[PDB]
Amino acid sequence: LARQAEDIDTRYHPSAALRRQLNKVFPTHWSFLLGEIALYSFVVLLITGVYLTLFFDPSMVDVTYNGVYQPLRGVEMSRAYQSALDISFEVRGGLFVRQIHHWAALMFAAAIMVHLARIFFTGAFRRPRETNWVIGSLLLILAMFEGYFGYSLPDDLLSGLGLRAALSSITLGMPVIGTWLHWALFGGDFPGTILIPRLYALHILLLPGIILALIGLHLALVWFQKHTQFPGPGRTEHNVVGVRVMPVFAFKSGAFFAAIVGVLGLMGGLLQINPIWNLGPYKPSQVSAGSQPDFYMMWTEGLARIWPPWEFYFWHHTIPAPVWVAVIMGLVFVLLPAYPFLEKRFTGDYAHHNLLQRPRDVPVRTAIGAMAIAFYMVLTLAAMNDIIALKFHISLNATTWIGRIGMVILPPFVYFITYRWCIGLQRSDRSVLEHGVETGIIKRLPHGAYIELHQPLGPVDEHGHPIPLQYQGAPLPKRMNKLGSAGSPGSGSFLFADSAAEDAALREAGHAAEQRALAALREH
């Protein structure tokens, strides 16, 4: 309505800022949506979590169930487990909501890992945006820890065992402080009356707020410093090619948010996850093969499993094996934000860049990325020892030794292999740039020869051989049908053809539109 707009303009006078923000242009590429996925997952996590807070009771006082689940009647149990079972069975649909929460958290972890991997591959971590990389590393670490605190609130015996092992062992194993930190955290011995309320408060109050504020900071930094773009025809280090915000960009974001909510709901309702009722209340005397916690902190458990038993004994003191695990995880923590400075000092490059590099052009960085991903994968699969030996009849000791040799002998092999792979990809791209696109058609040449009939991508010499081009980092169509190859079928939909005039007019309009678009892009 005109009246409301006139009143708003007269009151707040927002014209330039609205015009400035609304006319902004975003780069268009499929790899550039791997952050909105995580942000939508985060929104889902927040809404589900703010719902779940109305039916919990974090208490360690022993009580009797006498509820609805008959097989667990008359068993002394923690109050928090009782509240969890209540929200899982007594409240209409609570199980659905909590399963959605857990599945969305897993989606968040997977999305953040994928986004970090994509950012590392593209090499946008150079001088203009290094603080953004440091913030992203800190976000990853805090999100991982908070997610670790997630599955521990319904203190069943599995989560109790996991938290007991991790916290009690690593905290008490500190060479110098040791007992002080554990006693500060638990208030005395390991089983404490204040542990669960403290964990609940930390999981609902501090970490989510810090994470949200830092996500806002990250989004603001990526908003001000303009986004990068892949090399292309009309792309240059002083401009950005894409689409405007209002007509397209926001609509796509909303559609993507709806789509991720839909897939999350479908898969959460289809798949059971963490059936605590099947488990039992946590007690120190009960233990079983139930192990292998959530997969986004699983590398710590794998490292604990794989480490050889080395110990040192001096005057009335003893440093156990897990201290090495703590040292390794701390080193991994340190290395993640320190990578840009290390690379800058190693290569001695201090130039600004707004254009990314395709993965096949930098063998060294891709090799280091393969190094890291192979190490992470072998650490992750090593702690799957129980399930691997169970489903597939393999010796537990044999698989342990396979991992023990794998994390040391596998990395160099894949490093060398991916180095050769990148070199070969570069050579293939050069060969494609030299000659024409292989059309896959052969001629008999009555004198008796067979030729390939290359299709040149541009100018040719006086003899018909294509004039060699120059590599510019732009992708090229490996397959002939990718470019040109006019083969659009008739104007029908599924069973009946349309008028020939309509089909001809549509073909002319489409060809004219595509030709005008490419001509405008090339001229600009």
Partner 1 sequence: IPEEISIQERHDGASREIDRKTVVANLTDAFEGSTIRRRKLIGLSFGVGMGAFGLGTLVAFAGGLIKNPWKPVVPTAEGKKAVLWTSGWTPRYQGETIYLARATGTEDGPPFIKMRPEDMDAGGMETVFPWRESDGDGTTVESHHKLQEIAMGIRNPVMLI
Partner 2 sequence: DEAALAAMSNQELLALGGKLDGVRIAYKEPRWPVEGTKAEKRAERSVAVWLLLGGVFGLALLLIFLFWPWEFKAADFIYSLTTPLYGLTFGLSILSIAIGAVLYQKRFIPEEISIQERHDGASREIDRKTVVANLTDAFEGSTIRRRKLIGLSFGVGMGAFG
Query: For binding to partner 1 (CB under 8 A), which residues are involved?
Result: 9-10, 13-16, 18-19, 22-25, 51, 54-55, 62, 74, 76, 91-94, 97, 164, 179-180, 182-184, 187-191, 226, 234, 238-244, 246-248, 251, 283-285, 352, 354, 517, 520-521, 524
Which residue's CB is nearer to ligand HEM, number 325 or number 356?
356
**Closer Cβ to partner 1, 133 or 282, answer by number:** 282
Q: Is residue 298 at the binding interface for ligand HEM, with CB under 6 A as the rule? A: no
Q: What token pair was written down for 392? A: 């597939």
Ramachandran area for residue 93 (φ above 0: left; ψ -120 to 50: alpha; else beta): left
Q: Which of residues 191-250 bind ligand HEM (CB under 6 A)?
A: 203-205, 208, 211, 215, 218, 222, 227-228
| Contact call for residue 231 and partner 2 (CB under 8 A) | no
What does the alpha-carbon distance between residue 10 and residue 217 come to, in Å, rounded to a whole number? 32
Query: In this structure, how many other beta carbons lie within 10 angstroms of the beta carbon of residue 344?
Result: 15
**What angle, 0 to 180 degrees and rounded to 10, lies between the N-to-C axes of helices 94-122 and 250-270?**
130
Q: Which does 84 bind (CB under 5 to 8 A by kind): partner 1, ligand HEM, a copy of itself, none?
A: ligand HEM
Least distance (Å) from a copy of itself to the CB of residue 192?
11
Select from 85, 86, 154, 300 the one that contacts ligand HEM (CB under 6 A).
154
Question: Quick check: 363 and 423 in contact, CB under 8 A?
Answer: yes
Q: Tell me which of 1, 3, 4, 20 binds partner 2, using CB under 8 A.
A: 20
Closest of 505, 514, 466 to residue 486, by C-alpha = 514
Q: Which of ligand HEM, partner 2, partner 1, none interacts with 29 (beta carbon under 5 to 8 A by kind)?
A: none
Q: Which is nearer to partner 2, 265 or 363 (CB)?
A: 265
CA atoms lying within 13 Å on the CB side of residue 355 = 15
Torsion sign, CA atoms 455, 459, 460, 462? positive
CA distance 309 to 307: 7
- Distance in angstroms (rounded) separating the CA atoms of residues 231 and 239: 11
Helices (H), 89-194: 94-122, 130-150, 157-163, 170-172, 179-186
Dihedral angle sign, alpha carbons of residues 187, 192, 194, 195: positive
Instruction: Between 111 and 374, name the residue whose CB sits nearer to partner 2.
Output: 111
**Six token digits for residue 60:** 């360690």
Query: x/- binding map, residues 435-474, to partner 2, per CB under 8 A?
Result: ----------------------------------------
**Which element (helix H / strand E) includes 64?**
strand 62-64
One-letter amino acid of 365: R
For residues 68 and 89, is the Cβ–Cβ distance under 8 A?
yes
- What is the C-alpha separation between 326 and 300, in angstroms, rounded? 9
- Is residue 69 near partner 2 by the rule CB under 8 A? yes
Q: Does 258 bind partner 2 (CB under 8 A)?
A: yes
Are 386 and 289 spatial neighbours (Cβ–Cβ below 8 Å)? yes
* Cα 483 from Cα 304, distance rounded (Å): 53
Q: How far is the CB of 339 from partner 1 (least distance, A)?
A: 24
Q: What residues from 354 to 413 belong to the interface with partner 2 (CB under 8 A)?
A: 354
Stretch that binds partner 2, among 107-115, 129-137, 146-154, 247-255 (CB under 8 A): 247-255
Selected from 51, 256, 339, 419, the binder of partner 2 by CB under 8 A is 256
Q: Does 150 bind ligand HEM (CB under 6 A)?
A: yes
Q: Which does 20 bind (CB under 5 to 8 A by kind): a copy of itself, partner 2, ligand HEM, none?
A: partner 2
The span from the CA of 521 to the CA of 216, in Å, is 35
User: Of the two residues 9 and 434, which places its CB atom closer to partner 1 in the complex?
Assistant: 9
CA dihedral 181, 329, 215, 202 (to 10 degrees): -30
Q: If DSSP states are collapsed to H, E and C, what string results for 300-364?
A: HHHHHHHCCCCCEEECCEEECCHHHHHHHHHHHHHHHHHHHHHHHHHHCCCCCCCECCCHHHCHH
Amino acid letter for position 29? H
Q: Does 33 bind partner 2 (CB under 8 A)?
A: no
x/- site string to ligand HEM, residues 49 to 78, per CB under 6 A?
xx-xx--x----------------------
Strands 25-27 and 317-319 turn out to be unpaired
The C-alpha R_g of the chain, in whole angstroms, comes to 30
User: Which region among 125-133, 179-187, 375-383, 412-420 touches ligand HEM (by CB under 6 A)?
Assistant: 125-133
Q: How far is the CB of 212 from a copy of itself (least distance, A)?
A: 9
Measured CA distances, 410 to 203, 380, 401, 502 (Å): 38, 14, 13, 61
Please list, in sequence order, all residues whose beta carbon lies within 8 angstroms of the beta carbon of residue 468, skipping any fewer than 6 positions away. Answer: 433, 434
58 binds, among ligand HEM, a copy of itself, partner 2, none (CB under 5 to 8 A by kind): a copy of itself
Residues lying near a copy of itself in the complex (CB under 8 A) are found at 11-12, 50, 53-61, 63, 79, 83, 127-128, 131, 193-194, 197-198, 201, 204-206, 209, 224-225
CB of 506 to partner 2, least distance (A): 6
Q: Smaller CB distance to partner 1: residue 180 or 413?
A: 180
Residues binding ligand HEM (CB under 6 A): 32, 34-36, 38-39, 45-46, 49-50, 52-53, 56, 84, 98-99, 101-102, 105, 112, 115-116, 119, 124-125, 129, 132-133, 136-137, 139-140, 146-147, 150-151, 153-154, 203-205, 208, 211, 215, 218, 222, 227-228, 274
Residues binding partner 2 (CB under 8 A): 9-10, 13-16, 18-20, 22-25, 68-70, 89, 92-93, 95-96, 99-100, 226, 234, 238-244, 246-248, 251-252, 254-256, 258-259, 261-270, 352, 354, 491, 493, 498, 502, 505-506, 509, 513, 516-517, 520-521, 524
